[PDB]
Amino acid sequence: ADCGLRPLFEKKSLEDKTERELLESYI
Amino acid sequence: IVEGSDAEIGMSPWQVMLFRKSPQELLCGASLISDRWVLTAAHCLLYPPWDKNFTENDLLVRIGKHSRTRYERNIEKISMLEKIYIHPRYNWRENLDRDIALMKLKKPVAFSDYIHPVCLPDRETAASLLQAGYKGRVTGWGNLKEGQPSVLQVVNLPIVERPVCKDSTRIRITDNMFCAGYKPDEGKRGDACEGDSGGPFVMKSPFNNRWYQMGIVSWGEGCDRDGKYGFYTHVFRLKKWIQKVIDQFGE
Amino acid sequence: XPXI
Ligand SMILES: *[C@@H]1O[C@H](CO)[C@@H](O)[C@H](O)[C@H]1NC(C)=O
Ligand SMILES: [Cl-]
Ligand code: NA
């Protein structure tokens, strides 16, 4: 139910050092 | 992973290391898709041309890891396997079509800050996200060049159009595969490599912020060669089989 | 060939 939401990132409202690159690729 | 960087702690909490017991060695990557099911490449478990045919008690998995070699107390979990399941139409003779396997843990693993499952895509997520130019992420403890890292490596790579994938290789590509990597004109490099196979190609959904495993590191010709691309098992296309194995367990 |  909680799959794919990382305890040390999404669950704490923190982003990792390169995930922005993925987001920007969709545009 | 070629031309990647060190993962952050907990960056890929679904990452699994598949370990050979005898001799002790890293075999492959894998991914945690629930508390008791691990996804990997079939060729990690079964590849007769190189005399590979592992049984459950030949292997173990290590979950929650960061360091390639150190035992990480109170962080990592070492699990035995109850049963391996290989896709019944896995084509090891030809081109690794349907290169996918499931491994059932002997006991479910407890989740933690370091151990947490990835999502599998549904039809809409696959249709939306598996498009050329969109980037996903590959992770592993494999070779740094076509030489092993101290800690888990990560690189983001773009999905490549099928005709470009096909023109890059004489190997027969099927719709159960996709390829990813930079083109020679894009000025960036990166690839999975030997030791990374079986590990996950993941995408973060812009719609719900969840990480989905779209691919499994499957095959390639060398690593990070100009004009070559890495090939990945298309997880969504094989999902009915995954669901069947999981659903029939104990029934 | 194969990832391995
Ligand atoms: C793998 O090993 C098992 C156990 O001995 C055997 O039954 C099977 O034939 C082997 N698989 C292949 C495809 O060679
Ligand atoms: Cl299927
Ligand atoms: Na390349």
Numbering used by the authors:
A (entry chain L): 291 to 317
B (entry chain H): 321 to 466, 475 to 579
C (entry chain I): 1 to 4
Question: From the publication, what sentences describe this entry?
Answer:
Prevention of pathological clot formation can be achieved by specifically inhibiting the serine proteinase α-thrombin, an enzyme that occupies a central role in the blood coagulation cascade, where it plays both pro and anticoagulant roles. In an attempt to discover new anticoagulants with lower risk of bleeding, a new generation of peptidic DTI derived from the d-Phe-Pro-d-Arg tripeptide scaffold was developed. The structure of the proteinase in all the complexes is very similar to that of the unliganded enzyme (248 Cα atoms of the heavy chain of thrombin can be aligned with a r.m.s.d. of 0.22, 0.17 and 0.12 Å for fPrI, fPrC and fPrt, respectively), with minor changes mostly in the side chain conformation of specific residues.
All the inhibitors bind in a substrate-like orientation to the active site of the enzyme, forming an antiparallel β-sheet with the Ser214-Gly216 segment of α-thrombin. In the thrombin∶fPrI complex the proline ring has a different puckering with concomitant adjustment of the positions of Trp60D and Tyr60A side chains. Thrombin's Ser195 side chain occupies its canonical position (similar to that of the unliganded enzyme) in the fPrI complex, retaining the hydrogen bond between its OG and the side chain NE2 of His57. In the case of the thrombin∶fPrI complex Gly193N does not interact with the inhibitor, being instead indirectly bonded to Ser195 OG. It is conceivable that the similar-sized d-Leu side chain could establish equivalent contacts with the proteinase, as indicated by the comparable Ki determined for both peptides. However, in the thrombin-fPrI complex, accommodation of the isoleucine in position P1′ implies the displacement of Lys60F, which is found in a different conformation similar to that observed in complexes of thrombin with inhibitors containing benzothiazole groups, or bulky residues (Nle or Thi) at the P1′ position. In addition, the terminal amide nitrogen of Ile points towards Trp60D, which moves further away from the catalytic site. While fPrI is essentially unable to inhibit factor Xa in vitro, it displays a considerably more modest selectivity for thrombin versus trypsin (12-fold).
